[PDB]
Design an enzyme around this catalytic site. Structure first.
Site, PDB file in Angstrom:
ATOM      1  CG  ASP A  99      -1.929   1.032   1.263  1.00 15.69           C
ATOM      2  OD1 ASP A  99      -1.841   2.033   0.517  1.00 15.69           O
ATOM      3  OD2 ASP A  99      -2.873   0.865   2.057  1.00 15.69           O
ATOM      4  CB  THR A 100       2.315   3.205  -2.812  1.00 14.19           C
ATOM      5  OG1 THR A 100       1.086   3.377  -3.533  1.00 14.19           O
ATOM      6  CG2 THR A 100       3.076   2.033  -3.389  1.00 14.19           C
ATOM      7  N   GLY A 101       0.086   4.191  -0.410  1.00  9.83           N
ATOM      8  CA  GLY A 101      -0.545   5.379   0.125  1.00  9.83           C
ATOM      9  C   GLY A 101      -0.489   5.426   1.635  1.00  9.83           C
TER      10      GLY A 101
END
Lengths: 99, 99
Positions: free
Chosen positions: A25-27
Site C-alpha cells: 500500500d503505497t498510500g
C-alpha cells in the site's frame, strides 16, 4: 516479482516466522498488522484508521520475509481490518511504482 | 521510469486539462479528487472515509493525463482531504508495483 494492480496487491509476509496476509500500500506511510503476537519490546503508539485513534504496539527491527527477501524494519501491531505494509516497509523491501 | 517510495508518490495529474496533485495509492480500489467541477452527467455514490461516509459524484470516461500518458477513467469528486488515484487509474496508466 511484479504485482498487477488489476487485483488488490495482497501477499503473504512472514513476520518473525509467522505468516500474515498483507496489502502492499503505497498510500500508507507505515505498516500495521493484526494477528501476530509479536514481542516484548514495544513502545506504545497510536494510529487513526476508520473513525479515529486506536492503540498499537510499535516494534523496531522486526524480521519480515516477503517474496524471499528477508529484511528487518519497524512495524506496528493492533486491530486493523486490513494488514497494511506502508512505504516504510516497501522501501526496505526495495519496491518501486513502475511507469 | 520507476518511482522509489521514499517520499509519498505525489504527482500532478491533468483532469480534462486541469492540474491537481494526486497520491498514487495502490492501497485504493477507486479514485476521488476534490475541487474539480466535472459536470452533471454523474451518479451519486457514498464512500466510506475514516470517521464517516462522504457523498460523492461519479463520472465515467474522464480524460486523465498523468506523466505523459493520457487515458480515460472513472473518477469521483467529493470533499476528500487527499486526492487519491486508486488502482482503477493505476491499471489504466499501465503502472505496476515491482520487487
Amino acid at each position: 516479482p511484479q504485482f498487477s494492480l488489476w487485483k488488490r496487491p495482497v501477499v503473504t509476509a512472514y513476520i518473525e516466522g509467522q505468516p500474515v496476509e498483507v496489502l502492499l500500500d503505497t498510500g500508507a506511510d507505515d505498516s500495521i498488522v493484526a494477528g501476530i503476537e509479536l514481542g516484548n519490546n514495544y513502545s506504545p503508539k497510536i494510529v487513526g484508521g476508520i473513525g479515529g485513534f486506536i492503540n498499537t504496539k510499535e516494534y523496531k527491527n522486526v524480521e519480515i520475509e516477503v517474496l524471499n527477501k528477508k529484511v528487518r524494519a519497524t512495524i506496528m501491531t493492533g486491530d486493523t481490518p486490513i494488514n497494511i505494509f506502508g512505504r516504510n516497509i516497501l522501501t526496505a523491501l526495495g519496491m518501486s511504482l513502475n511507469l
